Amino acid sequence: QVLPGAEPLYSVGSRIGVLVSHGFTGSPQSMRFLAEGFARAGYTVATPRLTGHGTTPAEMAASTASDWTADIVAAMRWLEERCDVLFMTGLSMGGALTVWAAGQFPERFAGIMPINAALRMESPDLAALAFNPDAPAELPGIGSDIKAEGVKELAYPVTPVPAIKHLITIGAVAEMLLPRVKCPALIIQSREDHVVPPHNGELIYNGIGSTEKELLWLENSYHVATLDNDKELILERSLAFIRKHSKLAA
Amino acid sequence: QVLPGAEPLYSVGSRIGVLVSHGFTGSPQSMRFLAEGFARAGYTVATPRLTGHGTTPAEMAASTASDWTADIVAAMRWLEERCDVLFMTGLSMGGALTVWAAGQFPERFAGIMPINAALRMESPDLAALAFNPDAPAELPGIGSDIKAEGVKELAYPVTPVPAIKHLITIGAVAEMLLPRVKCPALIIQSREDHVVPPHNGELIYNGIGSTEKELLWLENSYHVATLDNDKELILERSLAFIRKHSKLAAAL
Ligand SMILES: [Br-]
Ligand SMILES: [Br-]
């Protein structure tokens, strides 16, 4: 069964498509505001629900980085039936997936919008859980890192430990592919992040092969920005990004 | 069936143990100079055959980073059966497992000697194979990077594509664990390496919380240095290291 508010969200629109990716332990709902704003300028929109996500933490414990990347690729396929121009955006690990997609498929995307991309967790305590024989099955969850008041994120309350390695792999693979990313990039990174070291934003800026790159520092937001109060601005600045580079409908 | 010369080297001795890890697509053969060195200098030694290695690329293609960490763990526990002072050394990915181990088990190790740790491969092309749906099953292997005329390593001829990710995972976990390695380290990086970027050494020396750390440049060898010209120099410099830090080594 799928937890309520965490169903996947695919709107049919023009020949312009946006792939919108949620994060680790999270669901599309953290993304549901942003995906909706795209589906309303008419774009075709795919917001997949990653394997193991939005159901049970035990099912996530059995999900791999191969699964999640396959979920992204199925979402592209779906989009590529309906579109000649594609774009991707994601949050956190979903932002690491964005950097991965643009690099795996150097030519597929017209531009990307990584927000708080989980490239380098920079946390030794997390790495100690990746291959630790004696670790407990569950740990406290990492969600709701938001400045706004009363704003909850629907994300698992536990971090299933045997999935941690996979988060690290996507971050690492993504970082190693930075040189190949050629498309325009609007990198979105909170000034203060308690989950992901915001040096990730600058890592990306210096790393990518793109000559059409801009870093946008958030200011009244923490990690889960798409739900924050700096969020309306993201949707806004994102749309102006799509337009400048798509050149279609628009 | 295990290919000739790739069997593990499990040698008994004193109360001081050395675990010795080989690399990716590699086997013990590439570590047999070192190990037989240590066994000879008294110490108990474990030189495991990493899961999927030294048999067939197809078996390796089915093996994971979980398997390989668990293999190092199993060997480590085999030493603990007979030992109370432990040391780790490995080549390449074996290097990263060494750094991983030191960080995973902060208290467990008297010292580490990572040789050309495969922490950051820094190759876009290899990354684009990590999760490639339409990549072939096999690519040309990476073995035998040796400055020394006439010297050949026993590594698979191919690199199985599905195992590539696990190589990167290990490298990245190790990297993230550097702050927690606090034990004495002899960091042995080649100056000319065509498999792992040689700036990896530097990445380690400035990375560890260890306070007893030494960076040692090799100058007459490539990546697979445990066989190069300097294999002798390494064995020797490592014994000094073990002897320096254990003090339970009395050897005539
Ligand atoms: Br492409
Ligand atoms: Br320990």
Residue numbers in the entry:
A (entry chain B): 35 to 284
B (entry chain A): 35 to 286
What did the published study say regarding this structure?
Here, we have used metagenome-based technologies to identify and characterize novel bacterial lipolytic enzymes which catalyze both hydrolysis and esterification reactions at temperatures above 70°C. Metagenomic libraries from enriched soil and water samples were constructed and screening revealed two novel lipases designated LipS and LipT which showed a high temperature optimum and also a high stability against thermal denaturation. LipS assumes the fold of a classical α/β hydrolase. The active site of LipS is formed by the catalytic triad S126, D227 and H257 with the catalytic serine located at the sharp γ-turn between β4 and αD. The position of the catalytic triad and the oxyanion hole (F58 and M127) at conserved topological sites clearly designates this newly characterized enzyme as a hydrolase.
The initial construct LipS-H6 in SG P42212 diffracted X-ray radiation to 2.80 Å resolution, while a second construct, LipS-WT, diffracted X-ray radiation to 1.99 Å resolution. Both constructs contain the native N-termini which are disordered until about residue 35. LipS displayed a dimeric character during purification by size exclusion chromatography. Consistent with this observation, the asymmetric units of LipS in SG P4 and P42212 contain one and two identical dimers, respectively. The structure of LipS was solved for two different constructs which crystallized in two different space groups. In the higher resolution SG P4, there is clear additional electron density immediately adjacent to the catalytic S126 and H257. In LipS in SG P42212, however, there is no such electron density. This excludes the possibility that the observed density results from expression in E. coli. We interpreted this residual density with spermidine, which was added during crystallization of LipS in SG P4 but not in SG P42212. Furthermore, data that the inserted domain assumes the same conformation with and without bound spermidine in structures of LipS suggests that this is rather a rigid structure. Identical conformations of the lid-domain, which covers the active site, in the absence and presence of a ligand, indicate that this domain may not undergo conformational rearrangements during the catalytic cycle.
